Design a protein around this ligand. Structure first.
Ligand SMILES: [K+]
Ligand SMILES: [Mn+2]
Ligand SMILES: [Mn+2]
Ligand SMILES: [Mn+2]
Ligand SMILES: [Mn+2]
Ligand SMILES: [Mn+2]
Length: 136
RNA sequence: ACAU
DNA sequence: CGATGT
């Protein structure tokens, strides 16, 4: 209903899906870019959305921030709640890196705690999430 | 049918 | 038009 401006917004960007994947996190109130992941040669949109949320959790935890996180990805929000990224991407030599990062992100979720609310950014009501890459 |  | 997901 109401945007919680005191929050962190995250999003994936890609070149192809599957394709080159990156993500970033921004201050929802200002749009200041707070973190950016170096592009990963092959991944899916949903793996990147997932990595973005988990990086957000780790970012906020390290700084002792109780801000919520916004993501526009129903899939990734669920994967984080489940602590399991049910990606269909083949595991091969090409996808080894993204799968390592995903597996490690899951491992982090299974060994740490957080109270960070993970909230759905309501794109249909509010427009693109502020971390969007402006490519669509 | 909804979310990317 | 193609793909990733619940
Ligand atoms: K969107
Ligand atoms: Mn997104
Ligand atoms: Mn795993
Ligand atoms: Mn986007
Ligand atoms: Mn367009
Ligand atoms: Mn489009």
């Amino acid at each position: 209903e109401e945007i919680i401006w005191e929050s962190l917004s995250v999003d994936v960007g890609s070149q192809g899906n599957p394709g080159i994947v990156e993500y970033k996190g921004v201050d929802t109130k200002t749009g200041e870019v707070l973190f950016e992941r170096e592009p990963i040669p092959i991944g899916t949109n949903n793996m990147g959305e997932f990595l973005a949320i988990v990086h957000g959790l780790r970012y906020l935890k390290e700084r002792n921030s109780r801000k919520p996180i916004y993501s526009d990805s129903q899939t990734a929000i669920k994967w984080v709640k489940d602590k399991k990224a049910k990606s269909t991407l083949v595991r091969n030599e090409e996808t080894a890196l993204i799968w390592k990062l995903v597996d490690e992100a899951e491992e982090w979720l299974n060994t740490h705690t957080y109270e960070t609310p993970i909230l759905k950014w309501q794109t249909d009501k509010w427009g693109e999430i502020k971390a969007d890459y402006g490519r669509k």
